[PDB]
Amino acid sequence: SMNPPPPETSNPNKPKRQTNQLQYLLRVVLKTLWKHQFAWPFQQPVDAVKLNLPDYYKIIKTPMDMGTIKKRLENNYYWNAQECIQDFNTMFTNCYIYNKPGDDIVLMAEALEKLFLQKINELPT
Ligand code: NA
Ligand code: NA
Ligand code: NA
């Protein structure tokens, strides 16, 4: 019923680098979604306490959010684009698992995911 600690956004042992693809993921993908009108619920870890959702972290064991993603990218936490794309996918999957089809938050996620897939289509090959 507490929130869990947030996902780590830096690790002193994990190697860093910034690929052209990782730059694109921060400067195009993350930024386009971050600025979207529906972005706020996804801009930080789900606060199950403030939202009064005591079963959220009983159901969702791999939480992820764009604030974590953004910090990870800003910190060169990822080694490759696939790691970061996986975190976006996890973020969307979590929302669909926990919520019902037709919920406002699911419609918001579906909107962001459509934009995400469109921008990943232009990831530098
Ligand atoms: Na570039
Ligand atoms: Na996805
Ligand atoms: Na569900």
Numbering used by the authors: 42 to 166
Q: Which sentences did the original study use to describe this structure?
A:
We sought to rationalize the different affinities and ubiquitination patterns through the cocrystallization of representative degraders with BRD4 and the evaluation of the binding modes. Several high-resolution crystal structures (1.1–1.9 Å) of BRD4-degrader complexes were determined.
We first tested a subset of VHL-recruiting degraders (compounds 42–45) and observed clear dose-dependent ubiquitination of BRD4, but not CBP, with all four degraders tested. A hook effect was evident for BRD4 ubiquitination, with structure–activity relationship (SAR) suggesting a greater degree of ubiquitination at lower compound concentration with increased linker length. The VHL-binding moiety was always disordered in these structures, but the linker was visible in most of the chains. When the linker was visible, it always packed against the hydrophobic surface patch between Phe79 and Leu148, although this may be influenced by crystal packing. The increased affinity compared with the parent scaffold may be due to such a hydrophobic interaction of the linker with a hydrophobic surface patch. The E3 ligase ligand is clearly solvent-exposed (as opposed to 35) and this may also explain its ability to ubiquitinate BRD4.
